[PDB]
């Protein structure tokens, strides 16, 4: 079990290097993607090339779950992992390519 955070974004992992936002949008055809292809952002490195990962925004948390039910399916050639991403996580991993979560639970 893995969650990035409570957000209207999902995390799309296992995408081919040869795909654009069109193919990823077509993958989430059963999901209402926020702002269309502008809601989709591949995690591009300093090398100007995608990690094979993206963040897709969605209109509703229900739509996020419809994205999560397709977590397994083969896109391009490979199996795709669909996680649940927060607006905070999505923004930070696009600016700073790092799957390391801001783990802070000062509890007692």
From Swiss-Prot:
Residues that bear Phosphoserine: 20, 51, 60
Ranges for domain RRM: 8-87
Subcellular location: Nucleus, Nucleoplasm
UniProt crosslink position (Glycyl lysine isopeptide (Lys-Gly) (interchain with G-Cter in SUMO2)): 32, 84, 95
Function description: This protein is a component of the heterogeneous nuclear ribonucleoprotein (hnRNP) complexes which provide the substrate for the processing events that pre-mRNAs undergo before becoming functional, translatable mRNAs in the cytoplasm. Mediates pre-mRNA alternative splicing regulation. Inhibits, together with CUGBP1, insulin receptor (IR) pre-mRNA exon 11 inclusion in myoblast. Binds to the IR RNA. Binds poly(RG).
Quaternary organization: Part of a ternary complex containing FUBP2, PTBP1, PTBP2 and HNRNPH1. Identified in the spliceosome C complex. Interacts with IGF2BP1. Interacts with CUGBP1; the interaction is RNA-dependent. Interacts with MBNL1; the interaction in RNA-independent.
Disease linkage: Neurodevelopmental disorder with craniofacial dysmorphism and skeletal defects: An autosomal dominant disorder characterized by global developmental delay, severely impaired intellectual development with poor or absent speech, characteristic dysmorphic facial features, and variable skeletal abnormalities. Additional features include feeding difficulties, inability to walk or walking with an abnormal gait, and cerebellar or other abnormalities on brain imaging.
Official protein name in the record: Heterogeneous nuclear ribonucleoprotein H
Organism: Homo sapiens
Taxonomic lineage: Eukaryota, Metazoa, Chordata, Craniata, Vertebrata
Boundaries of the shown chain within the full protein: 7 to 111 of 449
């Amino acid at each position: 079990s893995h969650m990035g955070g409570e957000g209207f974004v999902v995390k799309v992992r296992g995408l081919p290097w040869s795909c654009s936002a069109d193919e990823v949008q077509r993958f989430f055809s059963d999901c209402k993607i926020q702002n269309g292809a502008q809601g989709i952002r591949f995690i591009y490195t300093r090398e100007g090339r995608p990690s094979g990962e993206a963040f897709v925004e969605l209109e509703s948390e229900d739509e996020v779950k419809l994205a999560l039910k397709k977590d397994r399916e083969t896109m391009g050639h490979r199996y795709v992992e669909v996680f649940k991403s927060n607006n905070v996580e999505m923004d930070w991993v696009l600016k700073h390519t790092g799957p390391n979560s801001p783990d802070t639970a000062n509890d007692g």
